[PDB]
């Protein structure tokens, strides 16, 4: 798992972000350095890549470029981010440098009036959850269902449409999975509504739901490789207590300036799973993650 982040441009950091809240650039840089170190100290990530600085403060939102749906790297439509277009190019070369995909799928770009925002897609076990809010139209929902939804006894992939209100943030910012069973969500109106909808659309399933304080940004790498690392904001102690009591490992991260700029931890990182092409009938070695010689001792 390779995690891509971009350094802030100190010269062009806004004096005040959205809502007119003043921000301090030195503390922003210090918190980004701490975030990079925290990401490196995570055992799951194979490498952390640092792209060069770019003049716009919007360039820090690296995850906006594409989404990882199973083994498909789907590129978001370039509708509202024309000024970021070249920036996306500079990010793909990095992905090409690390041995990643040559290019992303352009399924969403080709479709007409298909507005989709990466971050409304949540990778639940055996499927994905998409949000039918302002950032995503019905056309994107239909295309995603036509592409990735399959109904079979064992080859089953589910695409769930979770409706949300206009003022709701992106679904990935307040809805996610941790470990192999834990559900992380905010104790807000939108989080409870999304949890209720997901319960309604997936019955007869037992799972644990953990409620964090609203506005407490989190980031948890859920995927094939099991992990217990759940990055959380430093201020919210009760969310950390709940995550620890759920049987996970909270990692408090100082995230004041980026929060006051409107950027979350999820949108500031680009986690991609890379593999190596196996020529012929050859298997590739994999690092161990369990105990050896259990029977002996």
């Amino acid at each position: 798992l390779h995690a891509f982040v971009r350094s802030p441009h100190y010269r062009t950091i806004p004096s005040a972000g959205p809502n007119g809240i003043v921000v301090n650039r030195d503390m922003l840089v210090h918190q980004f350095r701490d975030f990079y170190k925290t990401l490196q100290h995570c055992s799951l990530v194979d490498k952390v890549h640092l792209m060069s600085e770019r003049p716009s403060v919007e360039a820090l939102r690296v995850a906006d470029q594409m989404v990882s749906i199973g083994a498909t790297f789907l590129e978001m439509p370039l509708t509202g981010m024309e000024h970021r277009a070249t920036e996306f190019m500079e990010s793909m070369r990095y992905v090409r440098g690390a041995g990643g995909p040559s290019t992303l799928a352009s399924y969403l770009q080709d479709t007409e009036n298909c507005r989709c925002n990466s971050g409304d897609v949540v990778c639940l076990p055996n499927g994905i959850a998409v949000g039918h809010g302002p950032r995503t139209n019905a056309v994107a929902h239909t295309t995603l269902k036509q592409l990735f939804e399959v109904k079979d006894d064992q080859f089953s992939f589910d695409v769930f449409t979770l409706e949300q209100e206009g003022d709701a943030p992106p679904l990935g910012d307040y809805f996610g999975f941790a470990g192999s069973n834990v559900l992380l969500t905010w104790k807000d109106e939108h989080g409870l509504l999304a949890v209720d909808q997901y319960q309604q659309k997936q019955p007869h399933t037992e799972m644990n739901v953990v409620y964090l304080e609203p506005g407490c940004h989190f980031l948890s790498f859920y995927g094939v490789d099991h992990t217990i690392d759940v990055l959380v904001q430093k201020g919210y102690e009760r969310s950390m207590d709940s995550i620890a009591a759920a049987g996970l490992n909270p990692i408090p991260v100082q995230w004041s300036e980026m929060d006051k700029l409107g950027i979350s931890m999820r949108a500031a990182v680009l986690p991609l799973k890379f593999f190596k092409a196996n020529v012929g009938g050859m298997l590739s070695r994999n690092k161990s993650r369990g105990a050896r010689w259990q029977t002996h001792q």
Partner: peptide, 12 residues
């Protein structure tokens, strides 16, 4: 040198 400065800002 630009790359070295960028990498040294995050303490690497």
């Amino acid at each position: 040198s630009r790359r070295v400065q960028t990498l040294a800002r995050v303490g690497e």
